[PDB]
Design an enzyme around this catalytic site. Structure first.
Site, mmCIF file in Angstrom:
data_model
loop_
_atom_site.group_PDB
_atom_site.id
_atom_site.type_symbol
_atom_site.label_atom_id
_atom_site.label_comp_id
_atom_site.label_asym_id
_atom_site.label_seq_id
_atom_site.Cartn_x
_atom_site.Cartn_y
_atom_site.Cartn_z
ATOM 1 N N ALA A 84 0.722 -1.281 -0.091
ATOM 2 C CA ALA A 84 -0.085 -0.210 -0.106
ATOM 3 C C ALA A 84 0.724 1.239 -0.063
ATOM 4 O O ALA A 84 1.890 1.241 0.480
ATOM 5 C CB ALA A 84 -0.976 0.202 1.121
ATOM 6 N N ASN A 122 9.389 9.151 4.537
ATOM 7 C CA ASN A 122 8.292 9.801 4.001
ATOM 8 C C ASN A 122 7.471 10.181 5.305
ATOM 9 O O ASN A 122 7.277 9.366 6.316
ATOM 10 C CB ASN A 122 7.583 8.949 3.089
ATOM 11 C CG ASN A 122 6.757 7.786 3.557
ATOM 12 O OD1 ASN A 122 5.474 7.868 3.096
ATOM 13 N ND2 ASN A 122 7.316 6.766 4.383
ATOM 14 N N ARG A 123 6.535 11.416 4.977
ATOM 15 C CA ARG A 123 5.843 11.809 6.122
ATOM 16 C C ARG A 123 4.577 12.371 5.353
ATOM 17 O O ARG A 123 4.304 13.592 5.407
ATOM 18 C CB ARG A 123 6.425 12.926 6.868
ATOM 19 C CG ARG A 123 7.326 14.057 6.066
ATOM 20 C CD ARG A 123 7.294 15.498 6.884
ATOM 21 N NE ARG A 123 8.041 16.276 6.210
ATOM 22 C CZ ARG A 123 9.269 16.518 6.513
ATOM 23 N NH1 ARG A 123 9.899 15.776 7.194
ATOM 24 N NH2 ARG A 123 9.908 17.421 5.966
ATOM 25 N N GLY A 150 1.443 12.106 5.531
ATOM 26 C CA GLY A 150 -0.036 12.174 6.293
ATOM 27 C C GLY A 150 -1.311 11.653 5.541
ATOM 28 O O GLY A 150 -2.303 12.263 5.784
ATOM 29 N N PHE A 151 -1.143 10.640 5.060
ATOM 30 C CA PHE A 151 -2.371 9.910 4.273
ATOM 31 C C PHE A 151 -3.031 10.802 3.333
ATOM 32 O O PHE A 151 -4.394 11.266 3.375
ATOM 33 C CB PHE A 151 -3.587 9.499 5.396
ATOM 34 C CG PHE A 151 -3.284 8.170 6.088
ATOM 35 C CD1 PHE A 151 -2.505 7.181 5.785
ATOM 36 C CD2 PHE A 151 -3.851 7.991 7.368
ATOM 37 C CE1 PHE A 151 -2.300 6.122 6.572
ATOM 38 C CE2 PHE A 151 -3.691 6.789 8.083
ATOM 39 C CZ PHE A 151 -2.824 5.786 7.728
ATOM 40 N N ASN A 173 -6.743 -0.669 1.702
ATOM 41 C CA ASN A 173 -6.148 -0.425 2.936
ATOM 42 C C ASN A 173 -6.781 1.016 3.370
ATOM 43 O O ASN A 173 -6.617 1.829 2.903
ATOM 44 C CB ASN A 173 -4.340 -0.122 2.630
ATOM 45 C CG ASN A 173 -3.682 0.312 3.953
ATOM 46 O OD1 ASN A 173 -4.073 1.216 4.593
ATOM 47 N ND2 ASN A 173 -2.751 -0.569 4.349
ATOM 48 N N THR A 196 0.467 10.086 10.895
ATOM 49 C CA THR A 196 -0.799 10.522 11.543
ATOM 50 C C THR A 196 -0.614 10.332 13.009
ATOM 51 O O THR A 196 -0.555 9.150 13.737
ATOM 52 C CB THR A 196 -1.978 9.673 11.126
ATOM 53 O OG1 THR A 196 -2.145 9.794 9.628
ATOM 54 C CG2 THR A 196 -3.138 10.269 11.762
ATOM 55 N N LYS A 215 -1.887 -4.065 9.438
ATOM 56 C CA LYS A 215 -0.650 -3.505 9.314
ATOM 57 C C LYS A 215 -0.214 -3.054 10.576
ATOM 58 O O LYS A 215 -0.552 -2.010 11.220
ATOM 59 C CB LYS A 215 -0.788 -2.744 8.313
ATOM 60 C CG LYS A 215 0.638 -2.272 7.560
ATOM 61 C CD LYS A 215 0.557 -2.090 6.046
ATOM 62 C CE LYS A 215 2.106 -1.478 5.614
ATOM 63 N NZ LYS A 215 2.016 -1.240 4.334
ATOM 64 N N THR A 274 6.779 1.517 7.759
ATOM 65 C CA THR A 274 7.911 2.148 8.021
ATOM 66 C C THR A 274 8.448 2.429 9.394
ATOM 67 O O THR A 274 7.659 2.061 10.208
ATOM 68 C CB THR A 274 7.760 3.453 7.256
ATOM 69 O OG1 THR A 274 7.093 4.345 8.110
ATOM 70 C CG2 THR A 274 7.350 3.258 5.733
ATOM 71 N N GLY A 319 12.801 0.525 2.747
ATOM 72 C CA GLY A 319 14.029 0.220 1.840
ATOM 73 C C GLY A 319 14.800 -0.473 2.434
ATOM 74 O O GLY A 319 14.518 -1.187 3.505
ATOM 75 N N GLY A 358 11.849 -3.616 3.058
ATOM 76 C CA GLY A 358 13.116 -3.698 2.495
ATOM 77 C C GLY A 358 13.424 -4.670 1.503
ATOM 78 O O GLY A 358 14.446 -5.111 1.328
ATOM 79 N N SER A 383 9.649 0.263 -1.761
ATOM 80 C CA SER A 383 10.729 0.983 -1.971
ATOM 81 C C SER A 383 11.775 0.221 -3.188
ATOM 82 O O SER A 383 12.390 0.789 -3.863
ATOM 83 C CB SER A 383 11.748 1.076 -0.731
ATOM 84 O OG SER A 383 10.540 1.851 0.057
HETATM 85 C C1 LIG Z 1 6.169 7.095 -0.117
HETATM 86 C C2 LIG Z 1 5.418 6.030 0.719
HETATM 87 C C3 LIG Z 1 4.086 6.110 0.837
HETATM 88 C C4 LIG Z 1 3.505 4.848 1.586
HETATM 89 N N1 LIG Z 1 1.933 5.062 1.970
HETATM 90 C C5 LIG Z 1 1.602 3.708 2.614
HETATM 91 C C6 LIG Z 1 0.154 3.834 2.808
HETATM 92 O O1 LIG Z 1 -0.557 4.928 2.387
HETATM 93 N N2 LIG Z 1 -0.584 3.059 3.586
HETATM 94 C C7 LIG Z 1 0.198 1.938 4.196
HETATM 95 O O2 LIG Z 1 -0.027 1.084 4.877
HETATM 96 N N3 LIG Z 1 1.810 1.963 4.013
HETATM 97 C C8 LIG Z 1 2.230 3.057 3.205
HETATM 98 N N4 LIG Z 1 3.655 2.926 3.091
HETATM 99 C C9 LIG Z 1 4.360 1.916 3.580
HETATM 100 C C10 LIG Z 1 4.804 0.881 2.541
HETATM 101 O O3 LIG Z 1 3.630 0.344 2.087
HETATM 102 C C11 LIG Z 1 5.666 -0.516 3.048
HETATM 103 O O4 LIG Z 1 4.754 -0.955 3.821
HETATM 104 C C12 LIG Z 1 6.728 -0.115 3.767
HETATM 105 O O5 LIG Z 1 7.284 0.999 2.986
HETATM 106 C C13 LIG Z 1 8.022 -1.140 3.881
HETATM 107 O O6 LIG Z 1 8.032 -1.627 2.369
HETATM 108 P P1 LIG Z 1 9.384 -1.323 1.608
HETATM 109 O O7 LIG Z 1 10.616 -1.358 2.468
HETATM 110 O O8 LIG Z 1 9.465 -2.466 0.587
HETATM 111 O O9 LIG Z 1 9.158 -0.063 0.846
HETATM 112 C C14 LIG Z 1 4.311 3.962 2.272
HETATM 113 C C15 LIG Z 1 5.617 3.961 2.031
HETATM 114 C C16 LIG Z 1 6.187 5.072 1.268
HETATM 115 C C17 LIG Z 1 7.833 4.961 1.036
HETATM 116 O O1 LIG Z 2 1.733 9.242 5.570
HETATM 117 C C1 LIG Z 2 1.326 8.280 4.793
HETATM 118 O O2 LIG Z 2 0.810 8.272 3.805
HETATM 119 C C2 LIG Z 2 2.133 7.079 5.365
HETATM 120 C C3 LIG Z 2 3.422 7.010 5.541
HETATM 121 C C4 LIG Z 2 3.821 5.808 6.070
HETATM 122 O O3 LIG Z 2 4.965 5.583 6.378
HETATM 123 N N1 LIG Z 2 2.913 4.796 6.350
HETATM 124 C C5 LIG Z 2 1.602 5.005 6.172
HETATM 125 O O4 LIG Z 2 0.789 4.165 6.495
HETATM 126 N N2 LIG Z 2 1.271 6.272 5.693
#
Ligand SMILES: Cc1cc2nc3c(=O)[nH]c(=O)nc-3n(C[C@H](O)[C@H](O)[C@H](O)COP(=O)(O)O)c2cc1C
Ligand SMILES: O=C(O)c1cc(=O)[nH]c(=O)[nH]1
Ligand SMILES: Cc1cc2nc3c(=O)[nH]c(=O)nc-3n(C[C@H](O)[C@H](O)[C@H](O)COP(=O)(O)O)c2cc1C
Ligand SMILES: Oc1ccc(Nc2cc(Cl)c(O)c(Cl)c2)cc1
Ligand SMILES: Oc1ccc(Nc2cc(Cl)c(O)c(Cl)c2)cc1
Ligand SMILES: O=C(O)c1cc(=O)[nH]c(=O)[nH]1
Lengths: 335, 335
Positions: free
Chosen positions: B61, B110-111, B113-114, B138, B177, B216, B246, B267, B296, B318
């Site tokens: 997601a 990333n920050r 905020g949904f 999600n 959030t 999650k 994250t 990542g 990651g 990532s």
């Molecule tokens: C830019 C960005 C936006 C994300 N948005 C969401 C999100 O909206 N909802 C969610 O459950 N996780 C979100 N994530 C978390 C990722 O889906 C994932 O759980 C996390 O980054 C670890 O996966 P990865 O290391 O393979 O990237 C976001 C991550 C990134 C980097």
């Molecule tokens: O602000 C977001 O979209 C966001 C970042 C993140 O790491 N996780 C998440 O659920 N939302």
């Protein structure tokens, strides 16, 4: 650009690819073409085992088994070069094929058998080297030597290399020489570490310099085996531990070509297991002696994870094959 | 060949790159123009949460937050696609800049905020999709909702999406959030899960449809916190857990640009921590409900490492940015 070179060399079997590459490195060492492999890497000196390393990234043993390419490999940015493993007498090692790529896993499997030209030849190669960094010299036991008399082979090599090694590496972790890994256990290890340290002390008196000794362990030690190994290394005042060698594990490469080939697995399929051993090893050692971390390091972050686990230096072999000299510059620059 | 596509793409700000790539994916999704991004990957069906997943790899997601490009991303080979996070009402997310790329660490901070357009808009988009994989939706809490009445946001979303989701993912792990992660702890989680599980029972009789729900979690939970989360999920008969989101940790990215930026890290610098969380969660869960492993993953062995820690499925994000579509083919083919 390495990926193109990799694609070309991978058309050869791994051992012929290495032989071809070493042919080129020999043909440019000392030449104005030697700059073709020179790499500008930032300086990052680190003091470990009383030695001062250019940077914390060293070339693990097994690539230059006889030390015939120290200068060219040193020009690529390595903070240290570990040559070997070498045995007292030359020996051919195991039958070919004895080296296999797992390209999708970015790992290798090997049953080399300490294929080397003997310690005397290595010393002659070392005498002609100009490497300014730290030179590790990795020694092991000849196949025909009995396991309980293996110490003799290390002590023989130690005498011939003391004046030339920056540090000495004790290989009791190969899966491909019969019974070598038992030298990691109980009395065999204590017996061995005793003989080595007394030889070290006698050679310090003869040469008026301290050459540190580091033992290279395997990643397949149990938790209790590892605790005992750590304790024995502290009690015998060994200057370092190189963790780890290759693994008998295949759990991560099931279903891939060459996964059932006998030998030790290296590369990415060893990264996690190697890191966990260093962490457990670091906790036992509690900083009493440094850890050289090696095993599946194929990226800046992967190298930093080994540091966090408790390592002071890191080494690479398989990642240098699968990702090339760029990985050297990556790790030294950002570790 | 991605490494050249990435060099260009990385010339743009992380969020500008997403807007440009999605503008292209929106004009090709659902149309024969998605031959441009199609990838042949083999069938590798896995049974999980009472559903059949095309293959074990899913798109995590956060990439398609509103569900605009399901068909296009599906054409790239994903066995499952998780859209969101989406809230009941639209909201812009936190102030820009809110996305930072490390690169030497192959990680992202990333920050956001949904930032989404609301659940109603998402349901419309999902209505147009024709994805033969598993679609995960999600859902999260609107920014201004009181953490105490956060359940209401989740229940609202559930009713509107139940008919169209393959499974529902409950995001209570975002670090961006304020106070959302407290829904992981104590009876706050107990209250939320009771409400969600009851809405699910209702919605199943209303819609005559089986839809599993998965929670999650964050990677920064303490041992005690993880044991309580695991216990809470089993008690409330939640169908699955997505671990992990994250992390606030930065120990592996010290000295790199944007390492001090606020938000969640993803990542390569999250790979190890995510695998450890999964391993301990699986030990606690003892096969009583499945784990979707994310964090990651950037290689087949990294994906297999999460499988070995206990996960039944894996998701990437990532890694998709830094390795590109080839990673999908690699992971599905060899996992
Ligand atoms: C830019 C960005 C936006 C994300 N948005 C969401 C999100 O909206 N909802 C969610 O459950 N996780 C979100 N994530 C978390 C990722 O889906 C994932 O759980 C996390 O980054 C670890 O996966 P990865 O290391 O393979 O990237 C976001 C991550 C990134 C980097
Ligand atoms: O602000 C977001 O979209 C966001 C970042 C993140 O790491 N996780 C998440 O659920 N939302
Ligand atoms: C072909 C090959 C030969 C090796 N030879 C030796 C050796 O002679 N002595 C030694 O101590 N380790 C040897 N190793 C082990 C490596 O030095 C290294 O510790 C191990 O492969 C894990 O590191 P890596 O994953 O970065 O390759 C060898 C490894 C390979 C693949
Ligand atoms: O600078 C170098 C010197 C020697 C090597 N050896 C090598 C070793 C193996 Cl296993 C290979 O598959 C290839 Cl392509 C090369 C690689 C790089
Ligand atoms: O198919 C894709 C759609 C959107 C993205 N988003 C993206 C995200 C970041 Cl952080 C980047 O640096 C780039 Cl180049 C792209 C990446 C791939
Ligand atoms: O057979 C060898 O040369 C060898 C292989 C290996 O993995 N480790 C080692 O010490 N020696």
């Amino acid at each position: 650009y390495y990926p193109f070179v990799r694609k070309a060399l991978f058309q050869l079997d791994p051992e012929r690819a290495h032989e071809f590459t070493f042919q080129q490195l020999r043909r440019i060492t000392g030449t104005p073409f030697e700059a073709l492999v020179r790499q500008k890497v930032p300086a990052k000196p680190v003091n470990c085992m009383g030695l001062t390393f250019k940077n914390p990234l060293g070339l693990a043993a097994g690539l230059d088994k006889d030390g015939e390419c120290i200068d060219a490999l040193g020009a690529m940015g390595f903070g240290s070069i570990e040559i070997g493993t070498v045995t007292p007498r030359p020996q051919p090692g195991n039958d070919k094929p004895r080296l296999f790529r797992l390209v999708d896993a970015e790992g290798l499997i090997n049953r080399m058998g300490f294929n080397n030209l003997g310690v005397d030849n290595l010393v002659e190669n070392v005498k002609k080297a100009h490497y300014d960094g730290v030179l590790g010299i990795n020694i092991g036991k000849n196949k025909d030597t009995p396991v309980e008399q293996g110490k003799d082979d290390y002590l023989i090599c130690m005498e011939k290399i003391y004046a030339y090694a920056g540090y000495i590496a004790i290989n009791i972790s190969s899966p491909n020489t019969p019974g070598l890994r038992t030298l990691q256990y109980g009395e065999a290890l204590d017996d061995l570490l005793t003989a080595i340290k007394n030889k070290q002390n006698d050679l310090q008196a003869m040469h008026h310099k301290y050459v540190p000794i580091a033992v290279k362990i395997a990643p397949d030690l149990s938790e209790e085996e590892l605790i005992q190994v750590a304790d024995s290394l502290v009690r015998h005042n060994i200057d370092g531990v190189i963790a780890t060698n290759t693994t008998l594990d295949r759990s991560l490469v099931q279903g891939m070509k060459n996964c059932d080939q006998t030998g030790g697995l290296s590369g990415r399929p060893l990264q996690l297991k190697s890191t966990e051993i260093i962490r457990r090893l670091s906790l036992e050692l509690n900083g009493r002696l440094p850890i050289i971390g090696v095993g599946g390091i194929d990226s800046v972050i992967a190298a930093r994870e080994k540091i966090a686990a408790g390592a002071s230096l890191v080494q690479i072999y398989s990642g240098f094959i699968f990702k090339g000299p760029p990985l050297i510059k990556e790790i030294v620059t950002h570790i």
